[PDB]
Write a protein that binds this ligand. Sequence first.
Ligand SMILES: O=P(O)(O)OC[C@H]1O[C@](O)(COP(=O)(O)O)[C@@H](O)[C@@H]1O
Ligand SMILES: O=P(O)(O)OC[C@H]1O[C@](O)(COP(=O)(O)O)[C@@H](O)[C@@H]1O
Ligand SMILES: [Mg+2]
Ligand SMILES: [Mg+2]
Ligand SMILES: [Mg+2]
Ligand SMILES: [Mg+2]
Lengths: 501, 501, 501, 501
Amino acid sequence: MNKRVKIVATLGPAVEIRGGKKFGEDGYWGEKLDVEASAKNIAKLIEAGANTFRFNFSHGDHQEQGERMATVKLAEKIAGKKVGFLLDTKGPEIRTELFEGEAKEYSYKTGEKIRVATKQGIKSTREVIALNVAGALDIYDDVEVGRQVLVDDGKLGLRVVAKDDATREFEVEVENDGIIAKQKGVNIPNTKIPFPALAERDNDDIRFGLEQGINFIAISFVRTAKDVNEVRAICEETGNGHVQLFAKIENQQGIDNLDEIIEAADGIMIARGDMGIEVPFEMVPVYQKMIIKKVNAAGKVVITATNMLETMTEKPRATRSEVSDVFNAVIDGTDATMLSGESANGKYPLESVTTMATIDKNAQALLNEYGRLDSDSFERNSKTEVMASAVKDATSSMDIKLVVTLTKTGHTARLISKYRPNADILALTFDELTERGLMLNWGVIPMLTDAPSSTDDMFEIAERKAVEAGLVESGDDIVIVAGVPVGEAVRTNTMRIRTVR
Amino acid sequence: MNKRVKIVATLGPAVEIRGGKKFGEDGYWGEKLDVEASAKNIAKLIEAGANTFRFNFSHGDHQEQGERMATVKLAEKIAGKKVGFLLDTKGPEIRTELFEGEAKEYSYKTGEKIRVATKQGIKSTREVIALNVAGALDIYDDVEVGRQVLVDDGKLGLRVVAKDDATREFEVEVENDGIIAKQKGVNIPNTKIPFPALAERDNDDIRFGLEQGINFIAISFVRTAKDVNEVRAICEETGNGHVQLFAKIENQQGIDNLDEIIEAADGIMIARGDMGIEVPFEMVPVYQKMIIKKVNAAGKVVITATNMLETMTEKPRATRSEVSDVFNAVIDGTDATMLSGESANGKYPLESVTTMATIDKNAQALLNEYGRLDSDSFERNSKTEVMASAVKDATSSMDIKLVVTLTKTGHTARLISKYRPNADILALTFDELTERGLMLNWGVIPMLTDAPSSTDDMFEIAERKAVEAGLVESGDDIVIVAGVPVGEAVRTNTMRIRTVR
Amino acid sequence: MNKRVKIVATLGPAVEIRGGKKFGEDGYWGEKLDVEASAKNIAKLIEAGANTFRFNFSHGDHQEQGERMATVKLAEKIAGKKVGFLLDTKGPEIRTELFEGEAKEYSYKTGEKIRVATKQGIKSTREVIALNVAGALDIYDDVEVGRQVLVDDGKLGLRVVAKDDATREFEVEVENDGIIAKQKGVNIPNTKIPFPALAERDNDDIRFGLEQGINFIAISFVRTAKDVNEVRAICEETGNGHVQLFAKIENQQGIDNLDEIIEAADGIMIARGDMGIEVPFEMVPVYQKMIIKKVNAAGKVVITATNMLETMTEKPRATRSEVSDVFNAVIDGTDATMLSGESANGKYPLESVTTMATIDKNAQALLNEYGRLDSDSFERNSKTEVMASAVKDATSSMDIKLVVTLTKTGHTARLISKYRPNADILALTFDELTERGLMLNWGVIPMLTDAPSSTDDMFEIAERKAVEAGLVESGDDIVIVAGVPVGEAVRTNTMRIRTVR
Amino acid sequence: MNKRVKIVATLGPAVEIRGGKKFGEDGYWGEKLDVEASAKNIAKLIEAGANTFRFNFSHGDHQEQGERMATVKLAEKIAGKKVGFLLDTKGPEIRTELFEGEAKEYSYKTGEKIRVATKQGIKSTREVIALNVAGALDIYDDVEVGRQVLVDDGKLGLRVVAKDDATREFEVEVENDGIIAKQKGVNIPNTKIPFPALAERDNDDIRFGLEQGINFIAISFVRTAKDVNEVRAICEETGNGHVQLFAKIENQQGIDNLDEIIEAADGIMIARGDMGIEVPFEMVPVYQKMIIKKVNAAGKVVITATNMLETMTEKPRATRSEVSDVFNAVIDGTDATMLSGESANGKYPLESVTTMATIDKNAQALLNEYGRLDSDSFERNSKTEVMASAVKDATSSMDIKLVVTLTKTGHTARLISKYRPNADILALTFDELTERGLMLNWGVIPMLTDAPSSTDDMFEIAERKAVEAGLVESGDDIVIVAGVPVGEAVRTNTMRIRTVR
Ligand SMILES: O=P(O)(O)OC[C@H]1O[C@](O)(COP(=O)(O)O)[C@@H](O)[C@@H]1O
Ligand SMILES: O=P(O)(O)OC[C@H]1O[C@](O)(COP(=O)(O)O)[C@@H](O)[C@@H]1O
Ligand SMILES: [Mg+2]
Ligand SMILES: [Mg+2]
Ligand SMILES: [Mg+2]
Ligand SMILES: [Mg+2]
């Protein structure tokens, strides 16, 4: 079977070889990067079913990010397969500061009374935790008594019991045993810190990514359509209008404004890590199912992210709850599933991609029986969408091995993908930007080909390209769609049912 | 607004002019037929939406039937529109004889004592009604004292009160006021008369009709699949394998054997008049709904017949129950509705066809809301059927004015019809026998055209034929299906959505 | 089986014996009414399944109507069964006047030019038709050129070609051959004649009926809720608040105002006779299905009326379209079906009731498979309605022979009836007005019993009353509902599943 | 908000205090159990929503298990709340032996070469791991070179690289970093070891548990119905016929024989840990959904087990995939969710139960929108089930706070539970064995009460018990079912809708 659900894999040091050493080996960071060895490891992730790589600009400077994108370009030629390039913005992060001295962390007991400083550009002590707030904002007046400062993925709770106006320090009570380490994520739920719609650092990072050549941006902590539209303006200004924007939903404001965000964006990334700290963790599954259905109804892309195979950072096999999570994301209707630390930082990046692909491929077989999405309820709002509905009908009526679309912009492929046909979708397109832009759409196999002329038989081309790719053999039935004839048709207007010779 | 539900109109004296006189005028029967004046009246019925004319061989002789068929052929040339020719057999039936002195009928009052003769080959008198029993059977020993003899659709009941062994006559009491006319149907409920497999008169009548040129045979009182297969053998032997056979279901044996009868036949006529006497009258609506559903599921034609606008035989307006019946037959899923005495024997044959057409056109607009048929439940058993399902999906997804099929045998048109699309179906075919054979399929407008060559654009031909027929105009959306290309396609394999230029 | 669909039979001379003579016999009107013989004929209609008699105040003076109601009171004691008494108002009728001389009618040809007079209290001539307009209203200024004056059930069309202001006469063209007889119904569609909300004659007739003792009023030509509320005021003023009002829907205004009429009334009579003249005849089946569903959703009673077995006025067997009409009314969800001329004026009143009962009883067996009503969609708006829903669930889960309700006002019986359970409903009530008021509710068998005390076992009473009535036998399962205990319960609160001993 | 989904919590050292020391503290294992301090920790889990405790007889000896059962009996008296006692058998399993010198465990690195002994009845060393094979079987000839030996839920893999015939040891390579501890589960995928029908140790363990007093037995690695029936025979022989048997499904033979296993058992535990090693890991979510649906359809209990909040063994917050898994188990239809190492072996046993309860309570609120189970599809196979269907209907029709059943054996409560009403279910029963036996049914709150006499009002008792339990207050609506009257009713036969006074 072809894997219909797409995989986003985050890259990092786990796949990178430095002077013969693997990540974690003593002296690793002493060696220089082995680009070709690193590219060969990335190529195995491609072959195992990674469809797009995520460059997390939360970690690593422009030089590191640029070298990693260059490494991926080599890997595509080794694998003989192209992938999408996705930039993930830092966004409005709050992190613990470095500590006074060599100290990298301190342990605390429940009940201990300590201080959180708001003043920026200072080091932490054990009794006074300093915060690196994005844009060096002053958060003192945005956090009330009774709020919670959560350190390192919500593991250590600090309850704000008092506010000292004279030092702009929070007087906090430690709510549970735990460690405060340097440069760890901080969340302060149910506060409104006036972060800008687009920080200068995120503007800078996006402009650098656009210069290197990306297909997607995932915007961290989208609160409103304005956060999306500010990035859209840079993409249009720089001649990168083809770049697709995924809004990351990871706080209550993003959930409250979801309809206007979906309208502004090309898709949604369900950023469950921050979402499950910022809102009640037991509500994340409710929001996941609702976001998937709304994004599919819009004909846009949804990525389900974070902790999907978390145990595989350290172990070669996932837990039963991780297998269940990946399976259920697919059944809920996700276009794509994602790996973060599992592929970037863990001991088992290749096994993480392989395991996710195996689960994804099994789950796609149960979408007829258990699938939550319901294409029968959609309004068919254009003639290309009417043709997409008819293709889904044909794949419901008989056994169709493949749907082929000859698509200039990918619009027909995206509408067929929206209807989730019981078939793979081969999208024959005529430029690499359209090809890479389809790589996160459910079921879509993008394939670059010459633009057909007025005199070409597009149905013979479709069958020949499908046979070349090894997607079909003698006796298989396929559905082909195209705008016939070239130079007269203004849209996909034709559906052919064809038996492969 | 085109009428999708087809009308079968029975012809008889009501539309016939004889020496300038109309049916009912003094001296009418002393005149000979005025062929042109009659053909002009028949052309009005064709223009009002009669799709097929029924020639009932229970009435008249071969000469009357042959002349009436020739009058309809002139009527088609006057109207500029072809119709289907349907022959209705006598079958294993009992009919009243001709009367001595060519009286046509007598009137009777409740309580009169008269006789019914069993001797074959004699004429009736007012006091002694003679029976024409198929196969010239003697039924004297088959009918006990206390049986009811019903004349003419059960309009007049005779109770057997004694049997006269000297004359083999039933002594009967007239149960209700009414008429006994020549060649009227006689039922004797709850008797078992051993009618032959195929009466010699039926063999003669079928061969005469096939020689004249017919498109359909409705077989009266079909008991088993063998009754259909006996007629099929005659059609195949004489080179008339294109003739379609409608089995009339009008007794318990036909109901019991319905599945095998549907399998052998091209369609079913729900002959409610006899059915409602031979089985309990309150079961006829149950059987009607169930037959319509099974025949549609088999991709065949169903005709609903008898008493549909019965009151319009004598009055210019139908009753509320007649309008309800026609409307409900359409909602139940009928391909065709039929007029018997209304068109053959009544004062308002034109108004009856017009009235039926008006109701049928209103009811087809409620099929989406109320329609009993459910095409979502069908198994798509072939690639042509897969395309028919996709066409229905396209007409459900957007406003489609017309479906056009280029069909050599009518197969694609019959499968599109089976799915009851929200559109009229223009069937372009290449021979007059295929054209007339589609005239009773729901929604199908048959039209004769030249077979396309391999240099022709079939989509341009489809649009041009539709415009020229006045079915569509600039800006209408149509679906076109065809087997592309001519000389290579096995079957219909292409669907195009086209805006009329 | 018990018949669940109720029958309304119109009474008239057909069942009345006068000095040994049957209606239609020479000298019939010369004889005096034989009350007891007439009561014995009415008792047979009761035994055959008439549940309510209709007294049509369109025909016959107070003396005739009062004597007929008295005759029905004798018939109930002969049959051993009570019936409902329904008064049908004359309403805003327009009728042709008597003719100059002995003349009872004239024939006309299409094209003939004649006059319709608006002046009241004058006789007709052949060339000048005079109208008896209800309340002697002047209709001249309410009828435009191009309107149609329709005589005798829409059979003769008169087109208004000109208006003569000097005689206030309509200049009309005869549109079809036909007869204008004295005292025939006239309709003038798409005109607004300012008839009062309640005419003095209708006020008078209702007050007379209320004095005699009626259970129901059917209000002719209801246009608005005001027409209902004016009759409600008389019922409340006279101490007859228990009388239920059925609005007759028979024109476009009534259809347009249906929701407010349903809210004001206790039920709707679908008066298809006038409705199919006043609105396009082909729309009556659309309005019938929609009215039935809306009235059932309101928990109120719907009667389907007019022409249901029309042929049985003259023939002992109905047409196939009449059988179909009755069957389909039941499947559409009607509470009751009605007879007018078939039972009032025809040759076969008893056979008409019997035939309607047979069809109704067969159709009730198909409501699980084909029934249009959908109780799963209702909001359960009270605790008694929650219990009604649970009773329907129990009758869906297992074979329940009977539902018994101990009901003071009939409210619980009406809510159970609304849900159309697969069981008969025995309604045990404690006064005759409540008993007779339930006689047109689907499935309800009203039965008068002593009000239970605090110490009675109501479940034993229910089983004993069901066994006495012959509705159940040993081993049958029943559902019983009641407000337990008496004097504490404020509503039906208890459901028992019980096996009969 | 009551928790409807039941929690099974496994007990082990995590909640046990030994000489004032907590699990993990230095010297813990050199101290003896502090029974009162331990019982106080267990009482906190009961108060947090543990409904049943699991005693895993794969760990420890009879004395440890017996003392732990006695500590839980004290914990119930501290909490003032009863729980279920569940014994989990060893079954046809392989476990690691005890180590020489009572080391508990050793840590290993990838690439280490060690041995696995097959000789039975010996202890492990760090370099030579010994196996406890059920039935003391010799597995040396059953395991080929190239097989994988997996330790502890597949956390640590050993590859067989050679076999040493002199010692009957496997020579293995450590595949990944991890721990080998005593009494850990060992899997050897794709081998066929002839485990006996019922191991002597399982016979001993079941008899010991039955002597101590248990309510449930979970049978490990159920292969066929005979594995359940062998245990049933022991329960029936010792007078413990009230003990309920949960078959653990954790291999292909159990899946293949699921229908006959469900028929013999009282429920199913979906033992995902072993299932995901013994069958392909990506099939476990398919089997989980299908088991839940079949067990509910049989009116039995299903427990979803293993890795549900696995990360809370070491961290105070679950991963996003763990929360998704718990949430989806509830939506799939599980009666119960289970904690293994989280409660038995982890740093946060209380927080793990609290976390599970929070997710289970949120997910039960989405069963109307997302729930997989469909009670509309069940055949109601008895009159008690008919009443359970009616109760569900009442909770769907209006807001019902609580369903109260007076149940002698729990049968009515089990059938109401099967239908998953939108309400909590208070089951008033009359003996402690019936009370504890209902503790794993979805939504059921069991409560012990005096058997009502024939003079008692059961509806008043139901309301009083509900108020006294704090489940309802004045103005809440409840449904009450019972068999009325006591001493005559066969079964539950009455439903009352009651407003709490
Ligand atoms: O797709 P199906 O049901 O196998 O039918 C295929 C057959 O139909 C045909 O296409 C005829 O269809 P048309 O008569 O509609 O052109 C044959 O040529 C062919 O053998
Ligand atoms: O209605 P069913 O399924 O036949 O069950 C009837 C049985 O249930 C019982 O009523 C027990 O029910 P409870 O344990 O809920 O009281 C038995 O007394 C009786 O034999
Ligand atoms: Mg985030
Ligand atoms: Mg017939
Ligand atoms: Mg009327
Ligand atoms: Mg196990």
